[PDB]
Amino acid sequence: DSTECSNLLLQYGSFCTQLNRALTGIAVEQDKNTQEVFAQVKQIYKTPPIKDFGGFNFSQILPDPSKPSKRSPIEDLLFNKVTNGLTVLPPLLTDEMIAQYTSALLAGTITSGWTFGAGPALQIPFPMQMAYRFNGIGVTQNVLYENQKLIANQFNSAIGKIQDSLSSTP
Amino acid sequence: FCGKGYHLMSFPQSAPHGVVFLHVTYVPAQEKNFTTAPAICHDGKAHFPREGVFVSNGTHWFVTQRNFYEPQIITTDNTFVSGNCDVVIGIVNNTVYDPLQPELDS
Amino acid sequence: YTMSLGAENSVAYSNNSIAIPTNFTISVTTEILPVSMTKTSVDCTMYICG
Numbered sequence: 001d002s003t004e005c006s007n008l009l010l011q012y013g014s015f016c017t018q019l020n021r022a023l024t025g026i027a028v029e030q031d032k033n034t035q036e037v038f039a040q041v042k043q044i045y046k047t048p049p050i051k052d053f054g055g056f057n058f059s060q061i062l063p064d065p066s067k068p069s070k071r072s073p074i075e076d077l078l079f080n081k082v083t084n085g086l087t088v089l090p091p092l093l094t095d096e097m098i099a100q101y102t103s104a105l106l107a108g109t110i111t112s113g114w115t116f117g118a119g120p121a122l123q124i125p126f127p128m129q130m131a132y133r134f135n136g137i138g139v140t141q142n143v144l145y146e147n148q149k150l151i152a153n154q155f156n157s158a159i160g161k162i163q164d165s166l167s168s169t170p
Numbered sequence: 171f172c173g174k175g176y177h178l179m180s181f182p183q184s185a186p187h188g189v190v191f192l193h194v195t196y197v198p199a200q201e202k203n204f205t206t207a208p209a210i211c212h213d214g215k216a217h218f219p220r221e222g223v224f225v226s227n228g229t230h231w232f233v234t235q236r237n238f239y240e241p242q243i244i245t246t247d248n249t250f251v252s253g254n255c256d257v258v259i260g261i262v263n264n265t266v267y268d269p270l271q272p273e274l275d276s
Numbered sequence: 277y278t279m280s281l282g283a284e285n286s287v288a289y290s291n292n293s294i295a296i297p298t299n300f301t302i303s304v305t306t307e308i309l310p311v312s313m314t315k316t317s318v319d320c321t322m323y324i325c326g
C-alpha cells in the first residue's frame with residue numbers, strides 16, 4: 001500500500017503487465033488442458049439401471065449413488081489420497097463435472113464400444129465388444145466366448161487388486 | 171488423431187506460419203436396431219462369424235459387416251466352427267446354409 | 277448459469293441387441309497447426325546503447 005514505492009515502480013514501465021499477462025496465459029492454459037483431456041464427448045451417456053454385462057463387474061469404476069459426490073470408489077479413494085497479492089483462481093470445471101465427464105466416457109465405452117468416439121453411440125452387448133477387442137489383438141472370438149466366465153472373474157479380480165494396491169501404497 | 175470419425179485420408183494446405191489439415195473421415199449414420207447373438211448353433215456345432223456379426227430383423231438371421239448394414243445368408247464360407255453349443259452363453263438355434271449341397275444334390 | 281456438459285443421451289443397452297449403421301457421411305474437418313514464428317534478431321549493442 002506504499003504510494004512512494006508504486007511511484008518509484010512506475011519508472012520501470014510495463015514489467016507488471018508482462019507478469020500478469022503471463023500468469024493469465026498459464027491460468028487459461030490450465031482450463032484449456034482440462035477441456036482437451038476430459039471434454040472429448042458432447043453426449044452425456046449413462047449406464048442402464050440393470051448392470052447385466054455378461055459377468056463383468058464395473059462397480060469400482062462406475063459412480064456410486066450412495067455417495068453425495070457421485071464418484072466411483074476408485075475416484076473417491078484417489079481424492080482421499082491427495083492432500084501479499086496472491087490469489088487462487090478456481091478451475092472452470094469443478095470436480096463434480098470432471099467426474100460426470102469420466103462417467104459419460106465410461107458409459108460410452110461400456111455400452112457402445114468405440115462407436116461413440118467415432119460418431120453416434122451404437123449399442124452392442126459387452127461380451128461382443130470384448131470379442132471385437134479380442135479380434136483386434138489377433139485372437140479369435142471363440143476363445144473369448146468359451147472362456148467368458150474365466151475372463152470376467154480375472155477382470156473383477158484385477159480391478160479389486162488395483163483398488164487394494166492404490167489403498168495400500170502411499 | 172486425424173479428425174473426428176473413422177479416418178480415411180487427409181489433405182495439407184499451406185497457411186501463413188502454419189498448416190491446415192483437411193481430414194476426410196467416415197462417420198456412420200442412420201443406425202438401426204437388430205437382435206444379436208454371439209454364435210449360431212447348427213448340427214450340434216457352434217458357428218462364429220469370420221469377420222462380421224450375426225443380426226436378426228425379427229424372424230430371419232443374417233451375417234453382416236460391423237460398420238455397414240449388408241445382410242448376407244449365414245453359410246459355411248463366412249463362418250467358422252469351434253466346439254459344440256454347450257459352452258457359449260447366449261447361442262441361438264438357426265440353420266447354416268452349405269453352398270456345396272445343391273452341387274451334389276443335382 | 278451453471279454450464280451443461282452435454283445433451284443427455286441414454287444408450288439403450290441390453291444383452292442381446294445391437295445397432296448397425298445403414299448409411300454414412302463423408303465428413304471433412306479442419307485442423308490448424310502453427311509451424312513457425314517470425315524470425316527476429318536484436319542488435320544488443322544498438323538496442324541498449326544506440
Ligand SMILES: *[C@@H]1O[C@H](CO)[C@@H](O[C@@H]2O[C@H](CO)[C@@H](O)[C@H](O)[C@H]2NC(C)=O)[C@H](O)[C@H]1NC(C)=O
Binds near residue numbers: 051057058060
Ligand atoms: C460387483 O462387485 C461389487 C463390489 O465387489 C459387489 O458388491 C459386494 O457384494 C458382496 C455380497 O453382497 C458384499 O459382501 C460386499 O461388501 C459388496 N462390496 C461392495 C463394495 O459393495 C457386487 O456384489 C458385485 N456384483 C454385482 C452383480 O454387482
Ligand SMILES: *[C@@H]1O[C@H](CO)[C@@H](O[C@@H]2O[C@H](CO)[C@@H](O)[C@H](O)[C@H]2NC(C)=O)[C@H](O)[C@H]1NC(C)=O
Binds near residue numbers: 228
Ligand atoms: C427379415 O428379412 C428377410 C429377408 O428379406 C425377410 O424375408 C422376406 O420377406 C418378404 C416379405 O414377405 C418376402 O417377400 C421375401 O420372400 C422374404 N425372403 C425370404 C428369403 O424369405 C423377412 O420377412 C424379414 N423379417 C422381418 C420381421 O422384417
Ligand SMILES: *[C@@H]1O[C@H](CO)[C@@H](O[C@@H]2O[C@H](CO)[C@@H](O)[C@H](O)[C@H]2NC(C)=O)[C@H](O)[C@H]1NC(C)=O
Binds near residue numbers: 211263
Ligand atoms: C436348440 O437346439 C438344441 C438341440 O436341438 C436344443 O437342446 C435340446 O433341448 C431339449 C429341451 O430342452 C432337450 O430335451 C434336448 O435333449 C436338447 N438337446 C441337446 C442336444 O441339447 C435347445 O433347447 C434348442 N434351443 C432353443 C432355444 O430352441
Ligand SMILES: *[C@@H]1O[C@H](CO)[C@@H](O[C@@H]2O[C@H](CO)[C@@H](O)[C@H](O)[C@H]2NC(C)=O)[C@H](O)[C@H]1NC(C)=O
Binds near residue numbers: 201202203286287295
Ligand atoms: C432401439 O430400441 C430402443 C428401445 O426400444 C430405442 O430406445 C428408445 O428410444 C426412444 C426414442 O427417443 C426413447 O424415447 C426411449 O426412452 C428409448 N428407450 C431406452 C430403453 O433407452 C432405440 O432408440 C432404438 N434404436 C433405434 C436406432 O431406433
Ligand SMILES: *[C@@H]1O[C@H](CO)[C@@H](O[C@@H]2O[C@H](CO)[C@@H](O)[C@H](O)[C@H]2NC(C)=O)[C@H](O)[C@H]1NC(C)=O
Binds near residue numbers: 200298299300
Ligand atoms: C444415405 O444418405 C444419403 C445422404 O447423403 C442419402 O442421399 C439422399 O437421398 C435423398 C432421397 O433419395 C435425396 O433426396 C437426397 O438428395 C440425397 N442426398 C445426396 C447428397 O445425394 C441416401 O439416399 C441414403 N441412403 C439410404 C439407404 O438411406
Ligand SMILES: *[C@@H]1O[C@H](CO)[C@@H](O)[C@H](O)[C@H]1NC(C)=O
Binds near residue numbers: 259260261291
Ligand atoms: C439376456 O438376459 C435375459 C434375462 O434378463 C436372459 O433370459 C437371456 O438369455 C439373456 N441373453 C443373453 C444372450 O445373454
